[PDB]
RNA sequence: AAGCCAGAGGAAACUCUGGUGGAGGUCCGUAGCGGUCCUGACGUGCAAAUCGGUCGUCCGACCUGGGUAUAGGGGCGAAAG
RNA sequence: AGAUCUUGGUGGUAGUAGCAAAUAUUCAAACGAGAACUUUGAAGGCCGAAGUGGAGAAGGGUUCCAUGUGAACAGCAGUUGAACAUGGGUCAGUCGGUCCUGAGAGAUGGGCGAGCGCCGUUCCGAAGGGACGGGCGAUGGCCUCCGUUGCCCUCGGCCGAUCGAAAGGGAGUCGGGUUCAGAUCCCCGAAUCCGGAGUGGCGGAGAUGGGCGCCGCGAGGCGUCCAGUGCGGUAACGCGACCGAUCCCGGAGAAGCCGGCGGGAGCCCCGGGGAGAGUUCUCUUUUCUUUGUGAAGGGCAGGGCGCCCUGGAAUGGGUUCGCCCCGAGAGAGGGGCCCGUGCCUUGGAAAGCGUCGCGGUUCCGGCGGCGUCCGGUGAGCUCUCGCUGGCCCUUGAAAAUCCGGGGGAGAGGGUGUAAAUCUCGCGCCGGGCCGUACCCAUAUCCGCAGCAGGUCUCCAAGGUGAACAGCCUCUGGCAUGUUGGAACAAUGUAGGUAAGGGAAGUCGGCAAGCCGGAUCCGUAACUUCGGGAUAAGGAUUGGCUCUAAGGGCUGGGUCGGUCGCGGCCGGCGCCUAGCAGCCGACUUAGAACUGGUGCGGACCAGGGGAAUCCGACUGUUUAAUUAAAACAAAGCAUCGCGAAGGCCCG
C-alpha cells in the first residue's frame, strides 16, 4: 500500500529539519538517486558515483555532469550556444 | 614429501647420490619404502607383499635399509 | 572448550595478524597465520572491470618464484590485456589505417583539378 | 576531496620524446571518458577543448581561464562557474571577459581556457540539513567549521 | 618491556651487577668506615632513571 | 523511508489493500563513553575527586591506542577564562 | 621565652581513633619450638567465558626459577612471600626490529641574521660518479678465449640528502618431544624463502626434420642442399621450460562505513559403537570424560566468474530474501579460468592421545596389548571466503618491492650428438647484528604504598532467555581482598516490612513506592502529516494430555520378443485431480483436564495524563561545587577580495 502521504523519500529524516527544508531536499535527493538512461549504450544504468560524476554500469562510461542531476539546464544551454557560435565562426 | 607412483622411478631415485637412507614400514594394508633425499622424502606404496620383498632384495647396496618394525 | 592465544607478540586484530584454526596431530586447536588474499591483474585497457583469466592470483612478491606460464596467457598482450579489448584494438588499428588510406586516395583524386 | 568540481585525468603524447603525459584538467560539464580533447591555437570550439581566448567568438563562455598568458588555469575553477568572453581588440592583443563575480577583466588574448562550464552543477542548492554533514564537508577541507560567535 | 634496545639492556645489566651487598672481608680492612652498601636499590621501592 | 511484487477499483490521471525491502546525526537497552539526582556514602577517605544506587548517550558532530604538529602574553578552545 | 622563628628531639592525646567496599569458611594430618593465616587431603562456597581463566602491547627490570634464613619489611601472624641471601635462567634465515613511506622532521644550494644560528625542502645549484651497449688501447692471465682496468662515444629527470610505524606496506616454519625456570628459537622429523656458483654441477628443453643423388631385396646407411629462438585448442585458454637490451605501457602492493544473503571451517547439539570413571535405598541398556592428522605437494569435491562456442528470444523470458539481467545476445546445451583454508593421499603413525599391563637405568622420548569407529542435524555462535546492494557538498594513504605486456637494438650454428639461451626437474654452499625470562594488574605499570582510582588488545562452554542481559553450572582459578574471637546496647551505614489514612510531610513527591516482558485488542488532542505512540485503557500468561498447520530426499513403467535369475533395442502402457516409502528442525494456533486464582511466580523489566517557560532537534561545556535556558548547529543575512589580491603569521 501507499506508506506515506507526502514526505516520500524524506521520510527517513523524521520530524527534523523543518518541512520546507525537507521539501526542498526531496526533489534533489530524488534526482540524485535516480537512474538515468545512458546516452551511449541506451541502458537505464547511469547513476551518480560522486558529486558531479555519473557512471554507467553497463558500458563503464563516466561523464562529468551536475551535482544532483545528470546534466544541468545551464550546461545544456551552454552546449547549444557553443555549437551555434562554432557554426557561425566557420563557413 | 613426494609420492613415487611406480617402481622404476623409485629405483632411480634410490640410486641417487643424495639418497641418505631408505626406511621400510610394514603397515596392515601396504608396505611403504621411504627414501630420504636432499630435499624430499620419497614414498613408494606397495599394496601386496611379494613385490615389496622383491624390491627389498633389489634395493641398491651402500645404502641404509632401515626397517621401522 | 579450548580457548586460543596468539602465537606472536602482535596482539592486535590488524590486517597482518589474521589467523585460521588448525587441528594438529597432537589433537589440539592452534592458530595458523594466514597469508593475504592475492588479486588477479586488471586489464590494461582500464575499461572492463573483470580481472584477467589464466593468471594465478598471488601476492606480488610470490610472482617472482612462479614460472612464466603461470603469469601470462599465450596471446598478444596476454596477461596484461583482456581478449575482448585486444580484439577491439586489432579491429580499431586496422580500420583506422584503412581510413587513412581512404582519405589519402580521396585527396589524391581531388587534387586532379586546378 | 575538498572541491566540488570533478577532475578529469587526460593523457597526452609527449611531442619530443616517447612518453605519455598525464594531465589533471578541471572537468567541464559534458565531457566523458574515452573522449578526445584538443588543446592549442587551432583547436575547435567544443566542450573540453583548450584554446586561447583571442581565437574565440564574442559570446563564448569558458571554464578554466588563465589570469596571465602562460600560467595554468586560475579563474572560474569552482564547480558550476564560468567566465564569458565579451570583447576583443586585435591591436594590443587584449580580450575583455566577465568573471563569475560579475567583474570585468582585461586579459591577454593568449590566455587559454576550457570551453564550457565546469561540472559539479548546483551543489549549493541542496540544504546541508545537519551539523554532521557540515562536519564531514569541512573535515576534508580545513579546520574552520565550528564557528563561535 | 620485552622489546628493548641493546643500550637499554646494557644499562640494566650494569644496574643489576652493581645492586649487590658488600663483601664480608671489606669490614676487616684497616680503617674501613663502611658498614653496608648504602646504594642498594629495590625494583619496587625506587625506580631507575630511564 | 525510498525502491519492488501481486490483487482490486478507475475512461484516464491515478487510487486502495496485502506483502517485500531495510533508511535514519531513529527509539528501548548491554559493552564503551559520560556524569543527573540522592545535595546518599566518605569527608585526618580506598581516593589531594573515590564508591553505591539512579541516570544521559550508545552508527555517529561515536569511543579509543600509538605516531605527529602547535609553547607562555604564546598555544589551543562546539567558548566554561 | 617568644618572631604561626630554624633544625633536632620528646610528651599529653592514647593503648585511643582505627585495622568494617566487592556472600565464607570448616574438619583432619604433616613439617615445625611455635599454626585462624603454610602445605596436603576432604567438605562448603565464589569468579561464571564481557572471568577472580589463558596470552600479549606500553611500562617495570630480574620482580622469573631452585635452595636456605626468619633480623628488618609484608599496618595481626606466618613454618609463607614480588623480603633477605646464595646460585641459575632469555638460543631464530622463515617471531619482530632491521627495509619502505605516511602525517611530519630535516641538511646542502640560496636567503636572512650582530651572533649562537634559522628560513626554506625545490625554491636563486654546473645537483646524474651509473649503465649489459660500441670503439681506442695497455695481454694484466690457462697469451684458444673470456674475465681485469684507463680513456672516448652513446644512453641515463625518483627534480632531490637523510630520518620518520616492534598496530600501516613487507618473500619465506610447521608437527611432536623436552626444563626447576627457554623454546614456532633447543632436540627429533617434515618443509620453505632469498642470495651465489667464475673454472659452467647433472638432466630436460631449444633440437635435432624434409628434398635430391647413390648404395642397399626391403628396412637402413653415405654425400649434398634446405629449414629449425617450442607446441596444442574455433575460442575462453592450455602444456615443463619456451632467446632478447636501452626504452615505453600496465598490473599487484593499494584501500571507507553499513546492510542482506550464500559456501567453508571451529565450537555447540542429537543418535549409536568402544575405553575409563560416577550412581545403584529403588529406578536408570543410565550420567560424565575421551574417541588426532601440521606446513608443503598431487588429485577431487565445493564456491565464484562482467570468460568462450552454438544459437537467436513477445504469447517476453530468466531470476533474487531484496534485486537485477537480456538483439551491445536472454533461456538452453557444451566448455574455459580463479579460489580451493574442505575431502583423500605423501607427510602418517613410527608420532600423539585413551586405556590395560610388564621390566627396570636412584630421575627410561623404556617395552608390550587393544582402541583412536559410524552417523545426523541447524535463520545456532565465532572466524573466514564470496556475491549483491545502500550512504557520502565525507569518495576513504604513500613508497619500497615484485610481475606481465609492447618493441626488436642484438646474440647464437651450419646440419653438429650442435650453438646462444632457459621463469623446467634434481643437486651444491650461505643467511651476519639486536630483542626474546617474568608481571601485564583489587600485589611486578602510574597514582609517595601490596592504594576500591587509572592503563591498549586477542580467545570465549552448558541451562534459561530476544540476547556478549541478569541468575545457576563445567574447564580454569581463587580464599573473601592489609587481622581474628565473643556478644547482638544506643547512634549509624546498606537492605526490607508495616494496620487505617494517602503528600495532611516538605521550599519542592526529595527519597521510596507504583508500572514493567510477551500475545490479543484498543489508542486522543495536536502536528512540520514524518510523528505523538509502548499514548491512554483492557484481557491473557502455570502444569499436563493431545489436535492441526507450516518441509526435505529418493522411486512412479506396458513386458524373457531373452543370456550381457542379469544387460543393448523394441511390438511392449497411461502416475499427467499425483502417488509410495524414508527422514527431519523449530514455530504458531486451537482443545480438554488440572492446582487454595496461582502462573513475565527468581532474574530481566517504561508510572501515567493536562498544561506554562526556554532551547528547534542530535551534539558540546566549566577534569575537582554550575550539564543549563549557556556554546555549537543547519537555515537566514551582511561584509571584503579577480592574485601586484582579501584575511592572517613573521
Ligand atoms: Mg607490521
Ligand atoms: Mg586439515
Ligand atoms: Mg556560531
Ligand atoms: Mg610503582
Ligand atoms: Mg540514536
Ligand atoms: Mg537512545
Ligand atoms: Mg553528598
Ligand atoms: Mg565570566
Ligand atoms: Mg629557646
Ligand atoms: Mg579500638
Ligand atoms: Mg574495625
Ligand atoms: Mg556462581
Ligand atoms: Mg586476562
Ligand atoms: Mg617467585
Ligand atoms: Mg606484621
Ligand atoms: Mg631481592
Ligand atoms: Mg638528476
Ligand atoms: Mg627509515
Ligand atoms: Mg614460559
Ligand atoms: Mg591426514
Ligand atoms: Mg545463458
Ligand atoms: Mg599408536
Ligand atoms: Mg615469554
Ligand atoms: Mg589497585
Ligand atoms: Mg612519582
Ligand atoms: Mg590487596
Ligand atoms: Mg565479607
Ligand atoms: Mg580472611
Ligand atoms: Mg501503611
Ligand atoms: Mg494500606
Ligand atoms: Mg503541603
Ligand atoms: Mg506544613
Ligand atoms: Mg525520585
Ligand atoms: Mg503523551
Ligand atoms: Mg492452560
Ligand atoms: Mg537543547
Ligand atoms: Mg525555533
Ligand atoms: Mg567533558
Ligand atoms: Mg564541575
Ligand atoms: Mg555536575
Ligand atoms: Mg528562522
Ligand atoms: Zn551506458
Ligand atoms: Zn578490457
UniProtKB/Swiss-Prot annotation, chain A:
GO biological process annotation, one example: cytoplasmic translation
KW Aminoacyl-tRNA synthetase (keyword) present: no
Any one GO MF annotation of this record: RNA binding
Function according to Swiss-Prot or TrEMBL: Component of the large ribosomal subunit. The ribosome is a large ribonucleoprotein complex responsible for the synthesis of proteins in the cell.
Pfam families linked to this entry: Ribosomal_L37ae
Cited PANTHER family: 60S RIBOSOMAL PROTEIN L37A, 60S RIBOSOMAL PROTEIN L43
Zinc finger (C4-type): 38-59
Keywords: Cytoplasm, Metal-binding, Ribonucleoprotein, Ribosomal protein, Zinc, Zinc-finger
Recorded GO CC terms: cytoplasm; cytosol; cytosolic large ribosomal subunit; cytosolic ribosome; extracellular exosome; focal adhesion; nucleus; synapse
Binding site for Zn(2+): 38, 41, 56, 59
Name recorded for this polypeptide: Large ribosomal subunit protein eL43
InterPro entries: Ribosomal_eL37/eL43, Ribosomal_eL43, Ribosomal_zn-bd
Record gene name: RPL37A
Compartmental location: Cytoplasm
Curated annotation (Swiss-Prot), chain B:
One Pfam family matching this protein: Ribosomal_L38e
The keyword Magnesium is annotated on this UniProt entry: no
Top-level taxon in the UniProt lineage: Eukaryota
Record-level GO cellular component terms: cytoplasm; cytosol; cytosolic large ribosomal subunit; cytosolic ribosome; eukaryotic 80S initiation complex; focal adhesion; postsynaptic density
Record key words, sorted: Acetylation, Cytoplasm, Isopeptide bond, Ribonucleoprotein, Ribosomal protein, Ubl conjugation
GO biological process: 90S preribosome assembly; axial mesoderm development; cytoplasmic translation; middle ear morphogenesis; ossification; protein-RNA complex assembly; regulation of translation; sensory perception of sound
GO molecular function, one term: RNA binding
Compartments, as annotated in UniProt: Cytoplasm
Crosslinked positions (Glycyl lysine isopeptide (Lys-Gly) (interchain with G-Cter in SUMO2)): 3, 8
Location of N6-acetyllysine modifications: 8, 66
Family recorded in the similarity comment: Belongs to the eukaryotic ribosomal protein eL38 family.
Subunit structure: Component of the large ribosomal subunit.
Function statement: Component of the large ribosomal subunit. The ribosome is a large ribonucleoprotein complex responsible for the synthesis of proteins in the cell.
Protein name, entry field: Large ribosomal subunit protein eL38
Protein species of origin: Homo sapiens
Name of the gene: RPL38
Curated annotation (Swiss-Prot), chain C:
GO molecular function: cadherin binding; RNA binding; structural constituent of ribosome
Highest taxon of the lineage: Eukaryota
Phosphoserine modification, residue list: 11
A cellular component term, taken from the record's GO annotations: cytosol
Modification N6-acetyllysine, positions: 35, 42
Xref: InterPro entries: Ribosomal_eL34, Ribosomal_eL34_C_sf, Ribosomal_eL34_CS
Biological process (GO), any one: cytoplasmic translation
Compartments reported by the entry: Cytoplasm, Cytosol; Cytoplasm; Endoplasmic reticulum
Pfam families (alphabetical): Ribosomal_L34e
Primary location: cytoplasm
Cross-link (Glycyl lysine isopeptide (Lys-Gly) (interchain with G-Cter in SUMO2)): 107
Alphabetical UniProt keywords: Acetylation, Cytoplasm, Endoplasmic reticulum, Isopeptide bond, Phosphoprotein, Ribonucleoprotein, Ribosomal protein, Ubl conjugation
Assembly information from the UniProt record: Component of the large ribosomal subunit.
Similarity remark: Belongs to the eukaryotic ribosomal protein eL34 family.
Role, per record: Component of the large ribosomal subunit. The ribosome is a large ribonucleoprotein complex responsible for the synthesis of proteins in the cell.
Full protein name: Large ribosomal subunit protein eL34
Protein species of origin: Homo sapiens
UniProtKB/Swiss-Prot annotation, chain E:
Biological role stated in the UniProt entry: RNA-binding component of the large ribosomal subunit. The ribosome is a large ribonucleoprotein complex responsible for the synthesis of proteins in the cell.
Pfam families listed in its UniProt record: Ribosomal_L39
Location(s), subcellular: Cytoplasm
Signal peptide interval: none
One term under GO cellular component: cytosolic ribosome
Family: Belongs to the eukaryotic ribosomal protein eL39 family.
InterPro entries noted in UniProt: Ribosomal_eL39 (IPR000077), Ribosomal_eL39_CS (IPR020083), Ribosomal_eL39_dom_sf (IPR023626)
Subunit structure: Component of the large ribosomal subunit. Interacts with IMPACT.
A GO term for molecular function: RNA binding
Superkingdom field: Eukaryota
Keywords: Cytoplasm, Ribonucleoprotein, Ribosomal protein
Naturally occurring in which organism (per UniProt): Homo sapiens (Human)
Name of the protein described by the UniProt record: Large ribosomal subunit protein eL39
Gene Ontology terms describing biological process: antibacterial humoral response; antimicrobial humoral immune response mediated by antimicrobial peptide; cytoplasmic translation; defense response to Gram-positive bacterium; innate immune response in mucosa; translation
